[model samples]
Structures are given as C-alpha cells and as structure tokens.
Target: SMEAPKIFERIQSQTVGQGSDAHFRVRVVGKPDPECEWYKNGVKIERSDRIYWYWPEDNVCELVIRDVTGEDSASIMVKAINIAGETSSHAFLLVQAK
Candidate 1:
C-alpha cells in the first residue's frame, strides 16, 4: 500500500590519513524530513567522542572526522528512519598512511 523511502542517493568517502580531516556527505530523497544516523565500522558514534554529525537540510546529511588516521579507514553505515520504515546505505573510507 505504501512505499519505503529511499534513504541515500549518493554516498562517498575520501582519503585523508595524513593527519587531515575527512568529509562525507549523504543525500536522501522522497522524504523531506528523516531521522538519520551514521555508524563507523558498525559502531554508533558517541557524542562524547570526536565525531561530529551535521544536517544541512532535510535531505542532506554530513559526517566529518578530524585528524584521520590509517585506522580510520572503515565502512560507514547510513540509516534513515521514519514512521514508514528504515532504509540504509553503506560506503567505505580509504586512507593512506605515510
């Protein structure tokens, strides 16, 4: 009777392991406003940690990590939840160490 909203349209990862910051962006469609969460290597980020999540708008989500290292290269899971259901997308991060 209803359709599940598509959580992500495009997902990308950048390499910045040389003591640089990495930026990742997620885009969603269908639902203007959705509850979005990001997981790093299957672990939910705790606010007490060095992870920052930003929502520029109802359809865009941004995750930024500072001072990335070789260990930081991992898969990021993006989930969008609503009353209808939940949708997810996955992207992998690549970092080069010196």
Candidate 2:
C-alpha cells in the first residue's frame, strides 16, 4: 500500500532584486517519499549550478536560484510524484531590475 504525495505546507511568492537570490521551500508528506521536480514558467528546469534543489529536512524540498535576473522572474513550481500518486506547490518570483 502507498500514500499519495501531498504538500501540507505550500510555497509563497517572493520578490527580489535582479542581482539577489531567490529561495523557495515546501514540505511534503507521503509514503515511499516521492521524487521532486522543479519547474519555471511551466517548463522543467534541469538542475544546474545557478538553479538547484535540495532537502533541508527529511520531508522538505528547497529550490534555490543564484543571482536571479529579469529572465528568472516567473512562476516556480515543485511537483512530487511516486507510485501512489502526486502533488505540487507553486509560487511566483518578482525579480525587479536593478
């Protein structure tokens, strides 16, 4: 038996300057701990040096962006999926030009 992934705590929208970094985080609950996929502007963003994901806690997901620029301002989402099911949390980052 398995439980569908659920993000009990969702992420919040953030506003940052062009040269600053943006942080997004959320906690999920499920059996067999699901996998996390981060997205920007509805497109999956492959993990890289400037953009990355990590788990600060056993059930928490963290998304980080370095030196966010105008092009980085958009909807950010994290989707967790497992054999049982899936869930997601979304937010937006307002990156104002410096």
Candidate 3:
C-alpha cells in the first residue's frame, strides 16, 4: 500500500564554527521508498566535494558540509516524495564567524 511520506526524525538546529564540518540528518518513512531533495534558504542543493548527500539506510538521509562558513548559515529544508504524496521538514544552521 502506498502512503504519504512521514518524517520520523527531523534534523535538529546546529551551531558550528568556521572551517568546521557540519552534518544534518533526518529520518523518514513511507511506502514505495520516498525520494528526497534538499534546499538551503529556498535554493536547491547539489552534491560536491564540500557538500555530500548520503542515505545511510532506507529511512535515513544525511547532508554534510565540509567546511562551515558564515554563508553556510541558513534555513535548510528536506522534502520527501513518493507516489502517494509529499512532506517536508526544516532546520537551521548557525555558523560562527572565525
């Protein structure tokens, strides 16, 4: 049976120092294996050497930023979707200046 995406655990707000690494993680569940997309301050995110996206398990998704900076501080959102529907969760990253 198909089901709408449900967030089991949401990413928590994080505070990090400049040049440090920051990790944001969330857990979601839904029938049909939901697909996830991440955004920062409303702009879609992409994977790169400094930015990484990981699905550690069927229900877990993680985003890692290699180096924290003032520009990295923003509201982050993750949206999950499946055949049935979609849902989203949000968190904030606070980066302290060096």
Best by lDDT: 2
TM-score of 1: 0.80
Off by over 4 Å in 1: 1-3, 30-32
lDDT, model 3: 0.89
Clashes of 2: 0
- The candidate 2 region of ten consecutive residues with least summed lDDT is 29-38
- Write the residue-wise lDDT of candidate 3 on 1-98 in tens digits: 79999999998888999999988888998998888888989998998999877899879999888888899999988898999999998999899987
Q: Give the TM-score of candidate 3.
A: 0.94
Clashes of each: 0, 0, 0
Worst 10 residues of 1 by lDDT: 1-10
lDDT of 1 by residue, 7-95 (tens): 55667767676578777777875443567788899998655445777787768887877777888899988787666677888888788
Return the top candidate by TM-score.
2
Between which residue pairs do clashes occur in model 3? none
Q: Which portions of model 2 miss their true places by more than 4 Å?
A: none
